[PDB]
């Protein structure tokens, strides 16, 4: 999920957008 | 956009900003 993707490693703006509604 | 580890409340504010009026879901488990 989000922690592993964007905290543990790094997320691009596009990857962050996966968590929007 | 910033190129970095976004954790905790920093992650949440990143979502708030990026998502706009759509909102977001934060499920860390
Ligand atoms: Zn801080």
Curated annotation (Swiss-Prot), chain A:
Disulfide bonds join 6-11. It comes from the Eukaryota. Coiled coil: none annotated. This is Insulin A chain. It comes from Homo sapiens. The chain holds residues 90 to 110 of 110 of the full protein.
